[PDB]
Amino acid sequence: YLKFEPSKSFGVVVSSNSNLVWSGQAIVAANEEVLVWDIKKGELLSRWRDENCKFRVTAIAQSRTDPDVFAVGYEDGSIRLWDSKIATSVVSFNGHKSAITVLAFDKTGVRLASGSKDTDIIVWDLVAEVGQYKLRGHKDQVTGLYFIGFLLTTGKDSLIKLWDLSSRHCIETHVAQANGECWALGVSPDFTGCITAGNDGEITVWALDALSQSVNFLQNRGTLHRSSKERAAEVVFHPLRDYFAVHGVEKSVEIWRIREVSDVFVQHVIVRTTGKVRSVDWALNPGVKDLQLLVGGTNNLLELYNIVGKDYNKALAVELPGHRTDIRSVAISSDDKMLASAANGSLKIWNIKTQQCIRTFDCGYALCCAFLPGDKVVIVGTKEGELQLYDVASASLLETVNAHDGHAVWALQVHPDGRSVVSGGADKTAKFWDFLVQSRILKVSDDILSLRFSPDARLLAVALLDSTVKVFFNDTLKLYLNLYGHKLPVLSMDISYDSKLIVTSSADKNIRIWGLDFGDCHKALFGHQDSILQVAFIPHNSDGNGHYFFSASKDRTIKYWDADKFEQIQRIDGHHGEIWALAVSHSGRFLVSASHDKSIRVWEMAGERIAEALELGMTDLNTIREWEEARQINPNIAPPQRNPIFVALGNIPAETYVLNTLQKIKPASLHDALLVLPFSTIPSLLTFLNLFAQRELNVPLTCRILFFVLKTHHKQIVASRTMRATLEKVRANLRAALRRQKDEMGFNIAALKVVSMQLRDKSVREYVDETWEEKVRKRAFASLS
C-alpha cells in the first residue's frame, strides 16, 4: 500500500501570473515556487518552495533599502516574506479572503501594502507582525498600489483613490476612465506624476503635489493613447532615467520617453517580441550605457532586451530549461534514465536524475510521441496528419511519412516486441507501420481517439468517437468483442500486464474496468469531477501490485486506484492546470505527469451590568475633573489615561457609554434592573441623570428612570443629605431641558396652525356660481365581527 510523493518538478520558467522582479538575476514565478535565474548563464540560482502551501504564487515585490528579503502574494490570500540569502519564509501573513494581486513596499521597508481581488487592501507592519489596519473603498478589485504617509491606489471600477494613513480614510477620489476600467498604474519615482492605463488603450496622466476646505491633490492634466487597443497589463517607470514602458498582454512593449501632455510624452521605441509578454520589468546593469528591459512572456520564456537611449536587439533569452507552449505527450525511456516530452512547436527530451534538458527538436504540432526500443529514435504523430521520426544520439530528423492526409494521429502505440508501430488517426482508418513500411491498415466506423495493445502481443483495442471500444485480435484483425456503455467518447485506455483487465477513461467523467474474458464491466466507478484524460497501469507485478492504475483528469487530479479491491488508494494533488499527459516507469517506481500548468512532475445580569457601567463612568468623571484642574493650573502635558475599553470604543464620553448601556435593555428589564439597583449605586445614577439633562439626550428616558428612582426611594432621599445638592442640580437641568423642548414644540404647532389656515385661505375657491356643492380624509378600518 505504498503511496506517492512529489520528488521532482521542472520544465518551467515564468508562468502566466504577473510581476517579474530584477535584482543580474531575474526573479520570476513558477506556479507555487518562486525561482531565481541568472540571465547570463541559463542555470537557475534557486527555488523558493514551501511544504505547507500548495496554492499558486501571483505577486512578487522587492523590499527597498534591503534586498534579500521579498514579499510574495499567493492565490489563497497569503503573503510570505522570503530571503535570498537563505531560502526560508521568515513571516507569513494570512489576512485576505482571496487572490493577492498587487504588492507595494514603503520607502523605509517597514510597511507593506497588499491589495487583493477580494478588493481589500491591507497594510502590514514588519516589526510587530500584526495586521495594522484595513482600508476599505473600491467597488471591485485593486489593480494598482503605491506609497507616496499617503497611499495612491487604483481599481477596476476605474477609480484612483488617494488614501491617508495617519487617519485611515480616503482623502481624494477621481475617476480615470468614464465607461471603462483603469487597468494599470505607474508612478514617477520622484512622485511628480502618475499615469494610469485604461481599457481602450488610453493612458490618463495625473500630476501630484508634494481637511475642512476643498482638498485638491490629483489633477487630470491630460490623456494619452498608445498604439494597440488592448487591456494594458502594466506601466513600469525607470528608477533612474526618464523612460517608462507600457504593455498589455500582447507581443509589443511600448517604451515612451519623458522630455500639452502629448508634447511631454513621445514614444521612444516599440519592441516586438516573439511571444505574448505578461510582465515587463526594468533592469539597470552596472557599467553599461543602455536600458535592460526584461520581459517575461506568457509563452514560457524570459527575454532581456537592450534599448539604446538617444532600436531593440534580442540580447539575452532563457528558453532551454522549458517547453515554450504546452506539453501534450510524455514518453519515458526503457532504461528509465531519460524522457521525451512532445509539445506544440517542439520536442524536448530531459534527464530524470539531473532534471535538466539534453536535446531539442522542432516539430509542428505534437499529439503523440513514443520512442522505439533501444531508445535511439523517437516517433511523433502530429496534427497535420503526418508521422515524423527523430533520433536522440545524433539529434536529427530521419524520416517523415504522410500517414493520414490532414487528420491528426490521435494514437501511437509501439508493438511490445518492438518491430511495428500503429497510428490511429482522425480519419476512419488506423495504419500499421513495420520497420518504416506500411504493412496492414484497418478501416473502421469513426475517428479513432485512442488505441493500445496487449503486453503479451495478442489483442489490440481501439477506442472510437462513437463512445465505444473495439477489442480486436492482433494476428488477424477480427472483432474479438466490443465494449459499450460510455455516454461520452473514450479518451484513453490501459490494459493489464497479463491482459485480464482493461480500464477505459471517458469524457463522461468516469472510468470502466472490463475483464477481457467476455468483456463484462467489473465496476463502473465515478471518480473525477471532470472528463478523465488518461489512464495507465504499472507494468511490473514484481512488487506485488500490478493491478493498480493511475488516472489523470481535467480537474487537476491524478488518482491511484486498485482494480482488485476496486478502491482509490491515493489522491494526487499538486497540479494547477488540466493535466494532459502522464506516463509511468517501466520499473513503475516513479511516474511523470505533464499539465496545462506547463510543469511536468515526477512522483516517487442587567442590573449588575448597568451598575458596573455606572462605576466605569464614575471613575472616568473623576479622572476628567482632575485633568481639568491640571490643565487649568498649567498647559503642560497631562494625559487623562482613561480605560482601554473607552479608548477601544473610540474615546466616547462616559455619558454616551452609560446612555448606551441604559438604552440597550428592553423596558421591562429596565424596570427590573433599576429596581435591583442598590442605594450605593443610586447617587452615581443621579449624577449621570444630571449629565443627561444638562447635555439633553433621551429626555423621556431620563425622566422615566429619574421618577422611578425617586418613587422607589422616596424616604431614603428625604432622609439623606448629599441628595439635596445633586437633586437640586438635576431639578434645574431637567426643568430647563423640558421647558426648552416644550417651547420649541409649541412654537412648531402654532406655526403649523397659522400656515395651515393661510393655505386654506389660498385654497378656498375662485369662481362664484349657484352651485357651492363643490365645497376630507377617510380610512377603511375593516373589522371581522
Binding site: 477609480l159 487617519s167 480614510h169 480616503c170 482623502i171 481624494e172 477620489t173 477621481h174 475617476v175 468614464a178 465607461n179 481637511l211 475642512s212 476643498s214 482638498v215 447635555r695 439633553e696 439626550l697 429626555v699 423621556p700 425622566c703 429619574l706 421618577f707 425617586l710 418613587k711 422616596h714 432621599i717 428625604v718 432622609a719 441628595m723 439635596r724 437633586l727 437640586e728 438635576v730 431639578r731 431637567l734 426643568r735 423640558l738 421647558r739 423642548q741 416644550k742 420649541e744 414644540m745 409649541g746 412654537f747 412648531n748 404647532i749 406655526a751 403649523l752 396652525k753 397659522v754 400656515v755 395651515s756 393661510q758 393655505l759 385661505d761 389660498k762 385654497s763
Partner: protein, 242 residues
Amino acid sequence: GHSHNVLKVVWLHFASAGADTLVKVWDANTGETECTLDNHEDRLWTLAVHSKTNILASAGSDSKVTFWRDTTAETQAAAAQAALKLVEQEQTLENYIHAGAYRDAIVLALQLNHPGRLLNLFTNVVTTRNPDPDSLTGLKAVDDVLAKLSDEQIFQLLLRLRDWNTNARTAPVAQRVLWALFKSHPANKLSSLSVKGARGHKSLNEVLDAIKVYTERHYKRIEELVDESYLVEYTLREMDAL
C-alpha cells in the same frame, strides 16, 4: 414586433419603418429592439439617411416629413460627466463629514438629496456640546443656510421632516430644525410654497397635516412629562423641611 407592413429597411451610419406609423431602430448582433419612434399621422412609407452622420428622414402617405438625429453619443457624454461630478461631490461630502464641517456638509447633503447622512449631521449639530447661545440650532452657520434655503430645498426638507417626525427617537432633532425653519422663514412664503412635486400624498396640505399631528402627539407626551416632573420640586421641598 410590428403591427402592419414594414415597407422600407435602411442601413445606418439598423432602422425599419412600418405601416403601423412607427419607425423603430435596433442592432443586428444583439437582435432586440433598441428604440421606437411615433411622430407621424396615419401611414409611413419610406426612409432616407444622411450618409455621413446618422440622421433619419421618415415620410409616408401623410404629408409630413420628420427628420431625426441621433443623440446617444451626447446623452452618453452627459451621463459620463454626471457620474464624474457625482463621485467627486460624494467624496467631498465624506470629507466634510470626516473633518466636521457640518455647515458645508449639510449644504452638500441637501444638494445630493440622500438623507441617511443628513439626519446624522442634524443630530450632531443639535448636539455639538458647545452651542452658541444666540443660535437657533446651535450653529450660526447652519442657521444661515436654513435662512438662505430655496423653495424646492425647503419643500424637500419638509418632506424629510415628516419622516423624521414619525420616529420618536429622531423627533427632537426634527422638531429643532423645524423650529429653525419656522423662525427663519415667514408664514407667507411657507403658505405660498409652490413646488412642481406636489401631487397626491406629498402635497403641501398633507405634508403639513402629518407634521402637525405628529407634533401634537410629541407635545402631549412632553406636557405629561412636565406635570409628572414636579415631583422633584416636591422632594426638594420635603428635604428643605428637614
